[PDB]
């Protein structure tokens, strides 16, 4: 598979290798804040990242992933819409060529400069590869980024990026604390959806925080210096690695806040 984000291999093409692209629970979606309803049944959200163990950062040709040790229940997400325990495995971002675009989810059609995805898998399925075959296998915590003040907790990420410029490069990335990427409020929207890249599997409970984090123009500029290509290959900047909003179909987006 040679999927990507360009004219020739971008999201409009994905359905030919991955027919579930046109499925019933695809992501991302536009969150219409006037149609989403507060749900009193939602339990409180629990982000337990105190014991998180980051290992490595990888340019996979699509984004850069900060990977965690998920061989035990270190860093977990529970509560909210979730039943049981979801283990953090990695986070990554999606971003734009310009500050006016980059997020996958939109809020009343508003696009943010970037979107952070903290990816967790349901431990009742034993491993990640089994979890992605299940409708409740993953929980993705999505956090919007807007450009304003710098986010100090992001700068360690920004600073390692020149060591992983091209596809297939990785670097040791230990002792990174993902709590420094969260906004103050855990108010969220939630809906059932999918992975936003191939294989597009319909295995995600999406939890999208309402409060964006602010990052600096300089910080997001450094994201845009990465490359989609491998070393020695013609330079294609890693920008606009986002899928546009997909049809909501027969889904309701629920708000955790009144
Ligand atoms: C193999 O693991 C994967 C594969 C794809 C995705 C995509 O879905 C998404 O929301 N962003 C993505 O890059 C993922 O993240 C949950 C994890
Ligand atoms: Na709207
Ligand atoms: Zn993502």
PDB file of C-alpha atoms and ligand atoms in Angstrom:
ATOM      1  CA  UNK A   1       0.000   0.000   0.000  1.00  0.00           C
ATOM      2  CA  UNK A   2       1.213   3.467  -1.009  1.00  0.00           C
ATOM      3  CA  UNK A   3      -1.319   5.651   0.632  1.00  0.00           C
ATOM      4  CA  UNK A   4      -0.549   9.162   1.674  1.00  0.00           C
ATOM      5  CA  UNK A   5      -1.824  12.735   1.557  1.00  0.00           C
ATOM      6  CA  UNK A   6      -0.966  13.959  -1.941  1.00  0.00           C
ATOM      7  CA  UNK A   7      -3.239  14.401  -5.028  1.00  0.00           C
ATOM      8  CA  UNK A   8      -2.404  10.983  -6.282  1.00  0.00           C
ATOM      9  CA  UNK A   9      -2.560   8.934  -3.119  1.00  0.00           C
ATOM     10  CA  UNK A  10      -4.558  11.060  -0.698  1.00  0.00           C
ATOM     11  CA  UNK A  11      -7.835  10.489   1.166  1.00  0.00           C
ATOM     12  CA  UNK A  12     -10.023  10.537  -1.998  1.00  0.00           C
ATOM     13  CA  UNK A  13      -8.106   7.478  -3.223  1.00  0.00           C
ATOM     14  CA  UNK A  14      -8.057   5.383  -0.108  1.00  0.00           C
ATOM     15  CA  UNK A  15     -11.333   3.598  -0.703  1.00  0.00           C
ATOM     16  CA  UNK A  16      -9.897   1.579  -3.619  1.00  0.00           C
ATOM     17  CA  UNK A  17      -7.527  -0.390  -1.347  1.00  0.00           C
ATOM     18  CA  UNK A  18      -9.636   0.147   1.826  1.00  0.00           C
ATOM     19  CA  UNK A  19     -13.285   0.022   0.980  1.00  0.00           C
ATOM     20  CA  UNK A  20     -14.288   0.646   4.625  1.00  0.00           C
ATOM     21  CA  UNK A  21     -13.281   4.232   3.818  1.00  0.00           C
ATOM     22  CA  UNK A  22     -16.890   4.659   2.761  1.00  0.00           C
ATOM     23  CA  UNK A  23     -18.247   2.826   5.903  1.00  0.00           C
ATOM     24  CA  UNK A  24     -20.851   3.711   8.459  1.00  0.00           C
ATOM     25  CA  UNK A  25     -18.612   4.899  11.282  1.00  0.00           C
ATOM     26  CA  UNK A  26     -15.693   6.745   9.700  1.00  0.00           C
ATOM     27  CA  UNK A  27     -13.583   9.418  11.284  1.00  0.00           C
ATOM     28  CA  UNK A  28     -12.935  12.255  11.646  1.00  0.00           C
ATOM     29  CA  UNK A  29     -16.234  14.129  11.734  1.00  0.00           C
ATOM     30  CA  UNK A  30     -17.433  17.710  12.179  1.00  0.00           C
ATOM     31  CA  UNK A  31     -18.633  18.253  15.711  1.00  0.00           C
ATOM     32  CA  UNK A  32     -21.700  20.479  15.550  1.00  0.00           C
ATOM     33  CA  UNK A  33     -21.803  22.013  18.997  1.00  0.00           C
ATOM     34  CA  UNK A  34     -25.482  22.900  18.642  1.00  0.00           C
ATOM     35  CA  UNK A  35     -26.564  19.295  17.887  1.00  0.00           C
ATOM     36  CA  UNK A  36     -24.310  17.443  20.351  1.00  0.00           C
ATOM     37  CA  UNK A  37     -26.285  16.688  23.494  1.00  0.00           C
ATOM     38  CA  UNK A  38     -25.123  16.647  27.054  1.00  0.00           C
ATOM     39  CA  UNK A  39     -25.260  13.057  28.356  1.00  0.00           C
ATOM     40  CA  UNK A  40     -25.757  12.703  32.131  1.00  0.00           C
ATOM     41  CA  UNK A  41     -24.983   9.004  31.921  1.00  0.00           C
ATOM     42  CA  UNK A  42     -21.257   9.678  31.078  1.00  0.00           C
ATOM     43  CA  UNK A  43     -19.054   8.690  34.057  1.00  0.00           C
ATOM     44  CA  UNK A  44     -16.147  10.904  34.980  1.00  0.00           C
ATOM     45  CA  UNK A  45     -13.047  10.697  32.658  1.00  0.00           C
ATOM     46  CA  UNK A  46      -9.847   9.326  34.237  1.00  0.00           C
ATOM     47  CA  UNK A  47      -6.483  10.074  32.689  1.00  0.00           C
ATOM     48  CA  UNK A  48      -3.873   8.223  34.718  1.00  0.00           C
ATOM     49  CA  UNK A  49      -0.491   9.022  33.207  1.00  0.00           C
ATOM     50  CA  UNK A  50       1.700   9.230  36.355  1.00  0.00           C
ATOM     51  CA  UNK A  51       3.543   5.956  35.555  1.00  0.00           C
ATOM     52  CA  UNK A  52       3.837   6.535  31.782  1.00  0.00           C
ATOM     53  CA  UNK A  53       7.095   5.217  30.266  1.00  0.00           C
ATOM     54  CA  UNK A  54       7.915   6.749  26.877  1.00  0.00           C
ATOM     55  CA  UNK A  55      10.488   4.874  24.823  1.00  0.00           C
ATOM     56  CA  UNK A  56      11.071   6.133  21.356  1.00  0.00           C
ATOM     57  CA  UNK A  57       9.966   8.608  18.737  1.00  0.00           C
ATOM     58  CA  UNK A  58       9.508   7.384  15.124  1.00  0.00           C
ATOM     59  CA  UNK A  59       8.919   9.131  11.782  1.00  0.00           C
ATOM     60  CA  UNK A  60       6.677   6.574  10.043  1.00  0.00           C
ATOM     61  CA  UNK A  61       6.286   8.592   6.785  1.00  0.00           C
ATOM     62  CA  UNK A  62       2.742   9.717   7.847  1.00  0.00           C
ATOM     63  CA  UNK A  63       3.392  11.443  11.232  1.00  0.00           C
ATOM     64  CA  UNK A  64       5.795  11.066  14.131  1.00  0.00           C
ATOM     65  CA  UNK A  65       4.734   8.685  16.894  1.00  0.00           C
ATOM     66  CA  UNK A  66       5.912   8.921  20.517  1.00  0.00           C
ATOM     67  CA  UNK A  67       5.778   5.328  21.679  1.00  0.00           C
ATOM     68  CA  UNK A  68       5.203   4.035  25.223  1.00  0.00           C
ATOM     69  CA  UNK A  69       5.793   0.838  27.115  1.00  0.00           C
ATOM     70  CA  UNK A  70       2.383  -0.767  27.119  1.00  0.00           C
ATOM     71  CA  UNK A  71       3.553  -4.208  28.431  1.00  0.00           C
ATOM     72  CA  UNK A  72       1.684  -3.397  31.697  1.00  0.00           C
ATOM     73  CA  UNK A  73      -0.951  -0.866  32.979  1.00  0.00           C
ATOM     74  CA  UNK A  74       1.341   2.146  33.377  1.00  0.00           C
ATOM     75  CA  UNK A  75      -0.515   4.947  31.654  1.00  0.00           C
ATOM     76  CA  UNK A  76      -4.266   4.280  31.210  1.00  0.00           C
ATOM     77  CA  UNK A  77      -7.473   5.974  30.222  1.00  0.00           C
ATOM     78  CA  UNK A  78     -10.718   4.951  31.948  1.00  0.00           C
ATOM     79  CA  UNK A  79     -14.173   6.344  32.667  1.00  0.00           C
ATOM     80  CA  UNK A  80     -16.168   8.705  30.459  1.00  0.00           C
ATOM     81  CA  UNK A  81     -17.907   6.530  27.867  1.00  0.00           C
ATOM     82  CA  UNK A  82     -15.425   3.693  28.384  1.00  0.00           C
ATOM     83  CA  UNK A  83     -15.954   0.304  29.994  1.00  0.00           C
ATOM     84  CA  UNK A  84     -12.775  -1.073  31.391  1.00  0.00           C
ATOM     85  CA  UNK A  85      -9.190  -0.089  31.004  1.00  0.00           C
ATOM     86  CA  UNK A  86      -7.376   1.344  28.010  1.00  0.00           C
ATOM     87  CA  UNK A  87      -3.567   1.389  27.835  1.00  0.00           C
ATOM     88  CA  UNK A  88      -1.587   4.184  26.255  1.00  0.00           C
ATOM     89  CA  UNK A  89       0.554   2.926  23.340  1.00  0.00           C
ATOM     90  CA  UNK A  90       1.494   6.065  21.390  1.00  0.00           C
ATOM     91  CA  UNK A  91       0.684   9.612  20.560  1.00  0.00           C
ATOM     92  CA  UNK A  92       1.063  11.588  17.363  1.00  0.00           C
ATOM     93  CA  UNK A  93      -0.200  14.701  15.682  1.00  0.00           C
ATOM     94  CA  UNK A  94      -1.861  15.820  12.460  1.00  0.00           C
ATOM     95  CA  UNK A  95      -1.080  19.351  11.208  1.00  0.00           C
ATOM     96  CA  UNK A  96      -1.274  21.766   8.346  1.00  0.00           C
ATOM     97  CA  UNK A  97       0.774  23.740   5.879  1.00  0.00           C
ATOM     98  CA  UNK A  98      -0.722  26.879   7.396  1.00  0.00           C
ATOM     99  CA  UNK A  99      -2.259  27.735  10.784  1.00  0.00           C
ATOM    100  CA  UNK A 100      -5.814  27.673   9.352  1.00  0.00           C
ATOM    101  CA  UNK A 101      -5.843  23.951   8.763  1.00  0.00           C
ATOM    102  CA  UNK A 102      -4.414  20.759  10.166  1.00  0.00           C
ATOM    103  CA  UNK A 103      -6.938  19.192  12.502  1.00  0.00           C
ATOM    104  CA  UNK A 104      -8.941  16.134  11.493  1.00  0.00           C
ATOM    105  CA  UNK A 105     -12.004  16.801  13.668  1.00  0.00           C
ATOM    106  CA  UNK A 106     -13.628  20.196  13.191  1.00  0.00           C
ATOM    107  CA  UNK A 107     -15.819  22.198  15.565  1.00  0.00           C
ATOM    108  CA  UNK A 108     -18.730  23.903  13.783  1.00  0.00           C
ATOM    109  CA  UNK A 109     -16.558  23.496  10.642  1.00  0.00           C
ATOM    110  CA  UNK A 110     -13.636  25.259  12.353  1.00  0.00           C
ATOM    111  CA  UNK A 111     -10.268  23.663  11.546  1.00  0.00           C
ATOM    112  CA  UNK A 112      -7.502  24.000  14.144  1.00  0.00           C
ATOM    113  CA  UNK A 113      -3.771  24.179  13.317  1.00  0.00           C
ATOM    114  CA  UNK A 114      -3.168  20.685  14.565  1.00  0.00           C
ATOM    115  CA  UNK A 115      -4.692  17.747  16.477  1.00  0.00           C
ATOM    116  CA  UNK A 116      -3.008  15.468  18.970  1.00  0.00           C
ATOM    117  CA  UNK A 117      -4.139  11.827  19.215  1.00  0.00           C
ATOM    118  CA  UNK A 118      -3.300   9.866  22.357  1.00  0.00           C
ATOM    119  CA  UNK A 119      -3.969   6.244  21.357  1.00  0.00           C
ATOM    120  CA  UNK A 120      -5.068   3.612  23.863  1.00  0.00           C
ATOM    121  CA  UNK A 121      -6.150  -0.012  23.552  1.00  0.00           C
ATOM    122  CA  UNK A 122      -8.678  -2.045  25.500  1.00  0.00           C
ATOM    123  CA  UNK A 123      -6.750  -4.431  27.739  1.00  0.00           C
ATOM    124  CA  UNK A 124      -9.619  -7.003  27.666  1.00  0.00           C
ATOM    125  CA  UNK A 125      -8.336  -7.884  24.120  1.00  0.00           C
ATOM    126  CA  UNK A 126      -4.774  -8.667  25.321  1.00  0.00           C
ATOM    127  CA  UNK A 127      -2.773  -6.926  22.572  1.00  0.00           C
ATOM    128  CA  UNK A 128      -3.192  -3.984  20.230  1.00  0.00           C
ATOM    129  CA  UNK A 129      -3.521  -6.051  17.077  1.00  0.00           C
ATOM    130  CA  UNK A 130      -6.467  -7.939  18.551  1.00  0.00           C
ATOM    131  CA  UNK A 131      -7.982  -4.756  19.897  1.00  0.00           C
ATOM    132  CA  UNK A 132      -8.155  -3.066  16.439  1.00  0.00           C
ATOM    133  CA  UNK A 133     -10.398  -5.920  15.230  1.00  0.00           C
ATOM    134  CA  UNK A 134     -13.048  -4.976  17.853  1.00  0.00           C
ATOM    135  CA  UNK A 135     -15.659  -2.168  17.779  1.00  0.00           C
ATOM    136  CA  UNK A 136     -14.579  -1.083  21.296  1.00  0.00           C
ATOM    137  CA  UNK A 137     -10.919  -1.887  20.871  1.00  0.00           C
ATOM    138  CA  UNK A 138      -9.342   1.619  20.969  1.00  0.00           C
ATOM    139  CA  UNK A 139      -9.943   4.881  22.792  1.00  0.00           C
ATOM    140  CA  UNK A 140      -8.351   7.929  21.165  1.00  0.00           C
ATOM    141  CA  UNK A 141      -8.110  11.126  23.166  1.00  0.00           C
ATOM    142  CA  UNK A 142      -8.063  13.977  20.667  1.00  0.00           C
ATOM    143  CA  UNK A 143      -6.765  17.465  21.617  1.00  0.00           C
ATOM    144  CA  UNK A 144      -6.861  20.494  19.351  1.00  0.00           C
ATOM    145  CA  UNK A 145      -3.862  22.764  18.949  1.00  0.00           C
ATOM    146  CA  UNK A 146      -4.180  26.475  18.225  1.00  0.00           C
ATOM    147  CA  UNK A 147      -1.278  28.836  17.584  1.00  0.00           C
ATOM    148  CA  UNK A 148      -0.635  31.372  20.376  1.00  0.00           C
ATOM    149  CA  UNK A 149       1.610  30.982  23.378  1.00  0.00           C
ATOM    150  CA  UNK A 150       4.183  28.184  23.460  1.00  0.00           C
ATOM    151  CA  UNK A 151       3.356  24.916  25.215  1.00  0.00           C
ATOM    152  CA  UNK A 152       6.382  24.206  27.378  1.00  0.00           C
ATOM    153  CA  UNK A 153       5.556  20.562  27.711  1.00  0.00           C
ATOM    154  CA  UNK A 154       5.787  20.191  23.916  1.00  0.00           C
ATOM    155  CA  UNK A 155       9.263  21.598  23.482  1.00  0.00           C
ATOM    156  CA  UNK A 156      11.112  18.311  24.192  1.00  0.00           C
ATOM    157  CA  UNK A 157       9.155  16.810  21.256  1.00  0.00           C
ATOM    158  CA  UNK A 158       9.899  19.779  18.979  1.00  0.00           C
ATOM    159  CA  UNK A 159      13.563  19.588  19.765  1.00  0.00           C
ATOM    160  CA  UNK A 160      14.083  15.960  18.833  1.00  0.00           C
ATOM    161  CA  UNK A 161      12.402  16.385  15.372  1.00  0.00           C
ATOM    162  CA  UNK A 162      15.521  17.282  13.505  1.00  0.00           C
ATOM    163  CA  UNK A 163      16.905  13.837  14.489  1.00  0.00           C
ATOM    164  CA  UNK A 164      13.965  12.057  12.787  1.00  0.00           C
ATOM    165  CA  UNK A 165      13.499  14.159   9.719  1.00  0.00           C
ATOM    166  CA  UNK A 166      12.796  11.389   7.250  1.00  0.00           C
ATOM    167  CA  UNK A 167      10.646   8.253   7.052  1.00  0.00           C
ATOM    168  CA  UNK A 168      11.985   5.309   9.045  1.00  0.00           C
ATOM    169  CA  UNK A 169      14.173   7.354  11.355  1.00  0.00           C
ATOM    170  CA  UNK A 170      13.679   6.900  15.100  1.00  0.00           C
ATOM    171  CA  UNK A 171      15.292   8.245  18.277  1.00  0.00           C
ATOM    172  CA  UNK A 172      15.383   7.258  21.905  1.00  0.00           C
ATOM    173  CA  UNK A 173      12.676   9.346  23.746  1.00  0.00           C
ATOM    174  CA  UNK A 174      12.541   8.343  27.348  1.00  0.00           C
ATOM    175  CA  UNK A 175      11.081  10.136  30.385  1.00  0.00           C
ATOM    176  CA  UNK A 176       8.619  12.242  28.368  1.00  0.00           C
ATOM    177  CA  UNK A 177       5.526  13.143  30.429  1.00  0.00           C
ATOM    178  CA  UNK A 178       2.387  13.285  28.297  1.00  0.00           C
ATOM    179  CA  UNK A 179       0.540  15.149  31.089  1.00  0.00           C
ATOM    180  CA  UNK A 180       2.245  18.282  29.797  1.00  0.00           C
ATOM    181  CA  UNK A 181       0.212  18.126  26.628  1.00  0.00           C
ATOM    182  CA  UNK A 182      -3.274  18.262  28.296  1.00  0.00           C
ATOM    183  CA  UNK A 183      -5.422  21.359  28.608  1.00  0.00           C
ATOM    184  CA  UNK A 184      -6.848  22.378  32.009  1.00  0.00           C
ATOM    185  CA  UNK A 185     -10.359  21.060  31.361  1.00  0.00           C
ATOM    186  CA  UNK A 186     -11.269  17.479  30.500  1.00  0.00           C
ATOM    187  CA  UNK A 187     -14.704  18.507  29.102  1.00  0.00           C
ATOM    188  CA  UNK A 188     -15.198  16.376  25.941  1.00  0.00           C
ATOM    189  CA  UNK A 189     -17.339  15.170  23.089  1.00  0.00           C
ATOM    190  CA  UNK A 190     -17.542  11.453  22.334  1.00  0.00           C
ATOM    191  CA  UNK A 191     -18.758   9.345  19.418  1.00  0.00           C
ATOM    192  CA  UNK A 192     -18.022   5.939  17.820  1.00  0.00           C
ATOM    193  CA  UNK A 193     -15.662   6.016  14.862  1.00  0.00           C
ATOM    194  CA  UNK A 194     -12.590   4.811  13.155  1.00  0.00           C
ATOM    195  CA  UNK A 195      -8.877   5.083  12.527  1.00  0.00           C
ATOM    196  CA  UNK A 196      -8.324   8.212  10.366  1.00  0.00           C
ATOM    197  CA  UNK A 197      -5.699   6.550   8.129  1.00  0.00           C
ATOM    198  CA  UNK A 198      -5.564   3.157   6.455  1.00  0.00           C
ATOM    199  CA  UNK A 199      -6.567   0.596   7.445  1.00  0.00           C
ATOM    200  CA  UNK A 200      -9.491   2.779   8.522  1.00  0.00           C
ATOM    201  CA  UNK A 201     -10.795   0.227  10.957  1.00  0.00           C
ATOM    202  CA  UNK A 202     -14.004   0.972  12.808  1.00  0.00           C
ATOM    203  CA  UNK A 203     -12.596   0.231  16.267  1.00  0.00           C
ATOM    204  CA  UNK A 204     -12.378   3.656  18.045  1.00  0.00           C
ATOM    205  CA  UNK A 205     -14.285   5.360  20.827  1.00  0.00           C
ATOM    206  CA  UNK A 206     -13.375   8.976  20.150  1.00  0.00           C
ATOM    207  CA  UNK A 207     -13.015  11.330  23.102  1.00  0.00           C
ATOM    208  CA  UNK A 208     -12.308  14.900  21.791  1.00  0.00           C
ATOM    209  CA  UNK A 209     -11.497  17.559  24.364  1.00  0.00           C
ATOM    210  CA  UNK A 210     -13.353  20.875  24.013  1.00  0.00           C
ATOM    211  CA  UNK A 211     -10.457  22.987  25.289  1.00  0.00           C
ATOM    212  CA  UNK A 212      -7.611  23.363  22.760  1.00  0.00           C
ATOM    213  CA  UNK A 213      -3.995  23.693  23.904  1.00  0.00           C
ATOM    214  CA  UNK A 214      -1.931  26.631  22.628  1.00  0.00           C
ATOM    215  CA  UNK A 215       1.430  26.066  20.947  1.00  0.00           C
ATOM    216  CA  UNK A 216       3.699  28.686  19.375  1.00  0.00           C
ATOM    217  CA  UNK A 217       4.085  29.451  15.716  1.00  0.00           C
ATOM    218  CA  UNK A 218       7.718  28.389  16.126  1.00  0.00           C
ATOM    219  CA  UNK A 219       6.732  25.035  17.589  1.00  0.00           C
ATOM    220  CA  UNK A 220       4.303  24.133  14.776  1.00  0.00           C
ATOM    221  CA  UNK A 221       6.806  25.497  12.171  1.00  0.00           C
ATOM    222  CA  UNK A 222       9.204  22.788  13.354  1.00  0.00           C
ATOM    223  CA  UNK A 223       6.548  20.120  12.745  1.00  0.00           C
ATOM    224  CA  UNK A 224       6.363  21.341   9.156  1.00  0.00           C
ATOM    225  CA  UNK A 225      10.067  20.744   8.589  1.00  0.00           C
ATOM    226  CA  UNK A 226       9.667  17.011   8.801  1.00  0.00           C
ATOM    227  CA  UNK A 227       9.621  14.929   5.663  1.00  0.00           C
ATOM    228  CA  UNK A 228       7.237  12.308   4.347  1.00  0.00           C
ATOM    229  CA  UNK A 229      10.034  10.881   2.237  1.00  0.00           C
ATOM    230  CA  UNK A 230      12.946   8.660   3.198  1.00  0.00           C
ATOM    231  CA  UNK A 231      16.559   9.838   3.468  1.00  0.00           C
ATOM    232  CA  UNK A 232      18.126  10.683   0.135  1.00  0.00           C
ATOM    233  CA  UNK A 233      14.755  10.907  -1.621  1.00  0.00           C
ATOM    234  CA  UNK A 234      13.193  14.025  -3.099  1.00  0.00           C
ATOM    235  CA  UNK A 235      12.028  16.248  -0.225  1.00  0.00           C
ATOM    236  CA  UNK A 236       8.302  16.327   0.391  1.00  0.00           C
ATOM    237  CA  UNK A 237       7.490  18.306   3.492  1.00  0.00           C
ATOM    238  CA  UNK A 238       5.310  16.548   6.081  1.00  0.00           C
ATOM    239  CA  UNK A 239       2.390  18.939   6.076  1.00  0.00           C
ATOM    240  CA  UNK A 240      -1.374  18.458   5.630  1.00  0.00           C
ATOM    241  CA  UNK A 241      -1.349  14.961   7.010  1.00  0.00           C
ATOM    242  CA  UNK A 242      -5.034  15.140   7.949  1.00  0.00           C
ATOM    243  CA  UNK A 243      -8.143  13.398   6.621  1.00  0.00           C
ATOM    244  CA  UNK A 244     -11.173  15.698   6.119  1.00  0.00           C
ATOM    245  CA  UNK A 245     -14.422  15.258   7.927  1.00  0.00           C
ATOM    246  CA  UNK A 246     -16.497  12.156   6.953  1.00  0.00           C
ATOM    247  CA  UNK A 247     -20.289  11.642   6.933  1.00  0.00           C
ATOM    248  CA  UNK A 248     -21.810  11.341  10.434  1.00  0.00           C
ATOM    249  CA  UNK A 249     -24.404   8.813   9.168  1.00  0.00           C
ATOM    250  CA  UNK A 250     -26.363   7.228  12.000  1.00  0.00           C
ATOM    251  CA  UNK A 251     -24.306   8.578  14.883  1.00  0.00           C
ATOM    252  CA  UNK A 252     -24.805  10.959  17.775  1.00  0.00           C
ATOM    253  CA  UNK A 253     -22.024  12.986  19.308  1.00  0.00           C
ATOM    254  CA  UNK A 254     -22.445  13.273  23.109  1.00  0.00           C
ATOM    255  CA  UNK A 255     -21.089  16.093  25.309  1.00  0.00           C
ATOM    256  CA  UNK A 256     -19.775  15.504  28.842  1.00  0.00           C
ATOM    257  CA  UNK A 257     -20.603  19.088  29.815  1.00  0.00           C
ATOM    258  CA  UNK A 258     -23.877  20.973  30.184  1.00  0.00           C
TER     259      UNK A 258
HETATM  260  C1  LIG B   1      -1.765   1.000  13.869  1.00  0.00           C
HETATM  261  O1  LIG B   1      -2.245   1.963  14.795  1.00  0.00           O
HETATM  262  C2  LIG B   1      -2.916   3.045  14.203  1.00  0.00           C
HETATM  263  C3  LIG B   1      -3.137   3.207  12.838  1.00  0.00           C
HETATM  264  C4  LIG B   1      -3.778   4.340  12.443  1.00  0.00           C
HETATM  265  C5  LIG B   1      -4.183   5.337  13.297  1.00  0.00           C
HETATM  266  C6  LIG B   1      -4.842   6.569  12.738  1.00  0.00           C
HETATM  267  O2  LIG B   1      -6.108   6.860  13.349  1.00  0.00           O
HETATM  268  C7  LIG B   1      -6.006   8.074  13.968  1.00  0.00           C
HETATM  269  O3  LIG B   1      -6.945   8.504  14.625  1.00  0.00           O
HETATM  270  N1  LIG B   1      -4.831   8.702  13.702  1.00  0.00           N
HETATM  271  C8  LIG B   1      -4.068   7.830  13.003  1.00  0.00           C
HETATM  272  O4  LIG B   1      -2.893   8.001  12.638  1.00  0.00           O
HETATM  273  C9  LIG B   1      -3.905   5.184  14.659  1.00  0.00           C
HETATM  274  O5  LIG B   1      -4.274   6.203  15.515  1.00  0.00           O
HETATM  275  C10 LIG B   1      -5.419   5.813  16.339  1.00  0.00           C
HETATM  276  C11 LIG B   1      -3.294   4.038  15.059  1.00  0.00           C
HETATM  277 NA1  LIG B   2     -22.436  24.051  13.239  1.00  0.00          NA
HETATM  278 ZN1  LIG B   3      -4.137  10.408  14.417  1.00  0.00          ZN
END
